[PDB]
Design a protein around this ligand. Structure first.
Ligand SMILES: NC(=O)CC[C@H](N)C(=O)O
Ligand SMILES: NC(=O)CC[C@H](N)C(=O)O
Ligand SMILES: NC(=O)CC[C@H](N)C(=O)O
Lengths: 432, 432, 432
């Protein structure tokens, strides 16, 4: 009857949380067998192994996906700078996403989820190391290794000269590779119709790897349950992690509720001079079903069906920015990246490092225009920024473990983002 | 007269055995000058050098050839799962090639050619190291280096903890790269007509490198004679190597004669319930000329000219599987890879290592559908598996030195393979 | 009036010498503040840093530009071996460029500019190391690292055995990569119309990177002034460098005047048996304006407007070789590469090493057919050979600092090259 309708539509996002609550069970079973009742680090890695094989070939495809889905994207941008009264919305989308992700980290590293009872050093003139990494030395070595400065001593006229020498270290720099792929993407657009084939090569190449990143997602529930099992063994506690998680769902949703209800409505009232609470009261029902379906793509047509008569928006802007803002202005993911990538930074206690805090915030504004629409789409697109800023990505497991609630909490602020942007632009254009 | 006909048609396979019997001559000449009558390892490498330059740029082209001849191959496979009574032949071709290569190694490492008078250690849970190498971490580092586990000691609560740490070591993993290229090859087929260009890119790219691997083969006779000369110098013996070779031609041909005359005719009689010796007695003459021309491509049309009336095969299956089985069901090469790559393993005494024995047997079943048709075509395609399972490939020289007999011995079992498969399928379809 | 005409046409080659004379000014300002009045090597590198960022992403684009502008070049060569009386001009262009670059180094390392008051070791059987580097082991490791032999000791029957072992060291080998790209370029031409797309891919790919190497050149004047400032600090002298430069402009222009006035006119009189000084006296005015505009592309149409009636050249060869020789026979750059890359070799005192002196001379004959037409075009194309023969490329700064005179001195010998080749071919064809 309806056991074929709902169960087969969102099977995978259902099955991926079936996996982790069963993955923790045999994780509890071996800690019910008790710690390393199985043999030590030479044999236990063989039983955490097919959890690595989700994570290992996940890093394989992000070399095509981050560089070939982005050239074909950035070649089809700027359609003649299409809106004199349209590009201000695109500038609105960027500043409401920076300000989204500004309090993203700025709440979490102020609130410290992860380092509660947990309780070499790098100079902040490693900003040039970030800039030397943006523009890579050559491309083929930039697909697997990246630049980094280590300090050695000279011991000449002073026992501590502390000279920075730069040795290229492993792990790719997709942070320094999407900057190539953007600046290659404008290049072959500017060249024009003679090099159209290179677009038609590349934007078919990502759909040749988006079609196999679907195949990786079907491996994920078998894969996830072996890196949540082999993640609670070496931690040995279960009461500890549900306080590790149990503060993280707080700072996400509080990070949404602070953002969603106040700070973009303050952006509303500073330009609209009307009531945002009279504004969104008409559009509660798409924001109701966006929490239900967890898809701004699915609630895309229902927005114009409601906001056009429940609020006085124009005709042509209902289809002009709101199809854009459903897959471009994604403030909901931009919190969810920005508060997770600093959360995993507090799991392993990497570094405070303000130079990383901007590049954990620029990329989180750049994956925010990335994955979209489908539920649990941000899990892939924050898996590329955890490889960008060299975090240990293997802690993705516990933070898509609770994705079933938090992505539904971010989908509603996602769909809210262009909606208030729609009402803000109509008062800028009808006022004339 | 006929000095232009025969001599110019198979010139290269003639000239490559002219080269090695002349290459051993000045190899005997410097050992007739006596050992290192020339200067030592700093000067003798300069005179073995243009033998390395066959072998060095041989490894260059196997990065395009193994990954671009295989996507364009695997995109044109499964034409709608073309045969309800046809795909059983393709399943027949695989199981008669595994069972071919099963006794491939299983004869040779039971018979030990190479380690007769010759007379760190790795754990057999390096199977995960093989599986961690199948699915690579990223593609660009998978074109030149591969994963491997080394054991270091921890010396904490036990002086021998033996922790496996994994450092990526040099030498590419085409074993882990053709698995990408297959699973990319099904990807852009499944995507359909929108990404047809990526096929039309790639299957023109291999013909842009198959046309220069012809040019490498013309360098080979100049090249071979300087790595058979500089291979018998450091071994210093000539009576030793002709016992090294003189057992290898045995186990190949015995490996064919055990396979060809008994074990697939036992596959015949278990399904046909007729006489295979009454079967192949009609088709001795193509099997006669297949030994002569050493080309299943050349003896491809002569098979239907004989087997269709000398035996009661059907009309449509004479052109349905037998054109397939001439370049797909190649059991003759699949012995010849599988008994050489363990033979070279016994020259350098690498390792017994059952984990390698399956991946010396999976790939030998995968290059068996690879190179075809032309004589001495398996020499290239076993040069890619000697780089797969990290054998020293420079001992290819002495085993194409005697290729002139053994490939003619494997061509006849090659052409035999689909022929008995043709007779087996007709008794499965005419019986109805 | 004319402040918009001249100033906006050659702005960049004006602005790049504005930059260096202002870049030396604050370079003099910090040495007017006196040496390391700023903090030491941990802080001064942060203020030489945006000079590195010209040089760093300069090395980025020379992986596409040297391999994708060269396949699309070498696929469109040999149009049916187009001239029975035309290819002798192309053979003339090569031998007048070797003989140009023969005295290129051969003047400079005989005259020693750079090592005047400046006042491990590698064996000359590192020629095989050059040949082992021409033909690379695999392509993807040839885009960032290259082969090199180091000698270790064996200490067995002699305390100094000096065995050469070969470890691959950093820095790419575009010397060994353009040899692939040529021999790939003939491959897909020979394959014909079926692989036309790979040409149409690649010759659109360089115009997708020639269009961003324009964007690098606009960064260059901001970029240059921070690596001439941070180059005179560690040298601390200003009177020293203007003797370092002040001999270099000598050996260039003397290298042109020896070449231009005598040695190709001796090639003239050995075949023409007429007066070259009666020859070029008619064409002083294009050679006048070639010094002025510093562009053989701009003085391309003015050559046929003068040399066709001021000298008795034919009709059809005026448009047959002289459009070729304006962008192929470039002897002016071939001095300017060949005397700079040995000049920078005498700045850092790298090595005398006759094996390098031919590969500093083969590539300088190969970039001579490279960049063209525009003034200061050789600065890019000698930046790729300084990465070829592993020179420190960061001394490009002081030798485009004085490019404004020397390229105008080489443009006139550039345009002279095919002009005398035009007069030489007409006396070979009208004589019949
Ligand atoms: N990561 C997310 O959940 C993004 C928000 C919403 N689900 C979307 O796909 O647009
Ligand atoms: N390597 C081989 O000789 C293969 C068998 C046969 N010569 C063929 O080309 O099909
Ligand atoms: N590097 C150079 O100046 C080359 C000579 C001349 N300017 C040209 O572009 O052809």
């Amino acid at each position: 009857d309806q056991v074929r309708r709902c169960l087969r539509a969102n099977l995978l996002v259902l099955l991926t949380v079936v996996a982790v609550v069963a993955g923790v069970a045999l994780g509890l079973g071996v800690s019910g067998a008790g710690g390393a009742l199985a043999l030590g680090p030479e044999r236990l890695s063989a039983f955490v192994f097919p959890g690595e094989l989700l994570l290992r070939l996940l890093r394989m495809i992000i070399l095509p996906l981050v560089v070939c889905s982005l050239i074909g994207g950035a070649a089809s941008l700027d359609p003649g700078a299409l809106g004199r009264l349209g590009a201000w919305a695109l500038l609105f989308f960027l500043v409401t996403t920076l300000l989204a992700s500004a309090l993203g980290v700025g709440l979490a590293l102020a609130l410290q989820p992860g380092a509660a009872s947990a309780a070499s050093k790098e100079v902040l003139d490693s900003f040039l190391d970030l800039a030397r990494n943006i523009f890579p030395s050559n491309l083929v070595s930039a697909a697997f290794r990246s630049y980094s400065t280590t300090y050695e001593e000279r011991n000449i006229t002073g026992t501590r000269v502390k000279v920075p020498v730069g040795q290229e270290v492993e792990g790719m720099n997709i942070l320094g590779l999407v900057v190539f792929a953007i600046v290659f993407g404008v290049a072959l657009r500017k060249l024009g119709p003679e090099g159209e084939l290179l677009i038609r090569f590349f934007n078919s190449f990502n759909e040749a790897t988006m079609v196999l990143v679907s195949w990786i997602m079907w491996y994920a529930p078998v894969g996830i349950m072996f890196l949540v099992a082999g993640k609670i063994v070496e931690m040995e506690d279960v009461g500890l992690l549900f306080a590790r998680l149990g503060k993280y769902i707080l700072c996400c949703l509080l990070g949404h509720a602070i953002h969603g209800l106040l700070v973009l409505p303050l952006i509303y009232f500073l330009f609209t001079r009307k009531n945002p609470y009279r504004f969104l009261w008409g559009i509660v029902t798409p924001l109701a079903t966006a929490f239900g379906t967890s898809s701004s793509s699915a609630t895309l047509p229902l927005m114009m069906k409601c906001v056009e008569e429940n609020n006085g928006v124009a005709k042509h802007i209902s289809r002009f920015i709101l199809p854009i803002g459903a897959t471009v202005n994604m403030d909901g993911a931009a919190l969810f990246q920005c508060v997770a990538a600093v959360f995993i930074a507090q799991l392993s206690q990497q570094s405070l490092d303000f130079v990383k805090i901007i590049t954990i915030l620029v990329t989180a504004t750049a994956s925010s225009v990335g994955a979209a629409g489908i539920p649990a789409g941000g899990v892939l697109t924050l898996a590329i920024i955890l490889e960008a800023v060299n975090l240990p990505v293997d802690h993705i497991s516990l933070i898509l473990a609770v994705d079933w609630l938090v992505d539904r909490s971010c989908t509603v602020l996602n769909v809210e983002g262009d909606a208030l942007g729609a009402g803000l632009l109509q008062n800028y254009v009808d006022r004339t």
